């Protein structure tokens with residue numbers, strides 16, 4: 001029971017027994033918490049509870065100290081001092097924002113705003129409390145017992161009565177029962193096991209709630225500005241390919257951490273791997289939340305970096321197939337590519353954290369606890385999609401609230417900004433530049449004249465809650481008959497059930513806007529499906545239309561975003 005106060009560091013025996021994370025609170029601050037919240041259970045070696053036999057008084061404001069023991073108003077001895085008085089809770093070694101984080105349900109956007117505007121220790125307290133709240137919530141869902149097996153990619157499921165039905169999509173990974181992690185999509189429902197097994201009827205699944213470890217390290221280390229490149233050793237022979245980023249690689253060696261905002265196709269992967277060619281002796285650990293993001297850095301490194309000093313770190317609990325061309329689990333190779341939850345405890349000359357909009361403050365803190373670096377580089381875009389906040393249902397989370405790094409990029413600006421998009425046709429670049437980049441993103445490519453927009457609301461049907469718009473897929477089908485060059489297009493939409501219907505009807509490869517992030521395709525066919533807050537989200541709209549290298553067809557539902565699209569309009 002010896003610890004430091006999560007609000008003002010003053011050492012204390014006190015801990016809130018009512019907080020899901022039981023934080024150490026100092027006498028002055030513990031009082032300010034118990035007197036202003038429903039939280040009244042205070043904990044030392046012994047809890048502050050009435051010592052009188054069979055007495056259930058556990059509220060610290062209704063208790064007193066009778067010698068060395070604690071009693072309520074009904075049991076206290078004549079000579080007894082209140083545990084709560086004079087702005088303090090009695091203990092050893094004798095805030096509004098802490099209260100809100102400690103008592104919120106994490107379903108309002110204002111909870112996440114506070115978790116990002118508060119002091120650094122309160123950001124970790126919020127990131128711990130939120131992750132633990134999300135984990136306990138995973139226990140509320142029902143068990144799915146297999147009723148029948150149709151084939152190798154088809155089954156019929158039976159659900160637990162009295163417990164809600166969890167959303168069936170790639171965002172929810174089940175744990176088969178100990179027959180490996182599994183995933184589900186749409187009475188014929190498709191089954192996707194991260195481990196191959198002959199689907200057993202009766203054998204059930206559950207969403208494995210992984211234990212929330214405490215956070216020790218800050219989301220961001222304190223900034224340090226240096227007058228010379230510290231601990232890194234540059235070249236003068238630096239390939240003309242990376243010539244554009246040498247002033248920015250020098251900025252990287254002259255600061256503890258640095259932020260890079262890179263709109264779609266501005267050269268983030270290229271910048272990250274080119275930092276390794278600029279400091280060729282420096283040991284670089286490349287990290288991201290997703291395997292897809294780490295694999296995209298592995299693919300760019302395979303082209304420029306020597307394959308022998310590269311290692312792709314794979315956790316023993318191999319979930320889904322990833323990058324195979326590097327020596328696996330060699331923690332000591334000069335270039336280590338690894339996800340945040342799999343990071344080994346090591347040090348580096350540079351740490352590169354990619355797709356920073358997908359990081360939570362919990363992930364930012366873990367990276368600072370597992371890796372001790374000379375320089376930390378955060379690459380990403382606050383105009384792209386953030387991590388899914390499964391408890392959040394009320395309000396929209398703005399980019400300045402995704403994490404501490406995004407909060408910085410949106411307020412003080414990024415340290416470095418990649419201003420030229422080399423991927424998209426100018427129609428797409430001009431549209432997103434105006435929409436999310438204050439007209440600072442410039443098009444390298446010319447207008448392709450293959451970017452079309454069609455205003456068609458169609459009919460919205462719902463597979464539980466994920467939406468379908470068959471008339472919009474019907475418009476795509478009609479378009480494909482007249483534009484067969486578009487046969488090579490990737491179908492993109494904000495809903496997996498729309499994608500499921502369009503895969504059966506169009507036969508095009510499917511992708512949600514969220515799963516398309518980081519990827520590029522020559523042709524993209526996008527159906528907005530609905531005009532909800534989800535399908536109208538500007539960061540999702542930005543990601544959807546910036547996937548295309550050559551042409552895009554947008555079948556829109558929202559008049560607003562249709563009007564903003566600087567594409568050739570089509571009739572039908």
Ligand SMILES: [Zn+2]
Nearest residue numbers: 005008026029
């Ligand atoms: Zn304190």
Ligand SMILES: [Zn+2]
Nearest residue numbers: 016018019039
């Ligand atoms: Zn509390």
Ligand SMILES: [Zn+2]
Nearest residue numbers: 050055072075
């Ligand atoms: Zn009592």
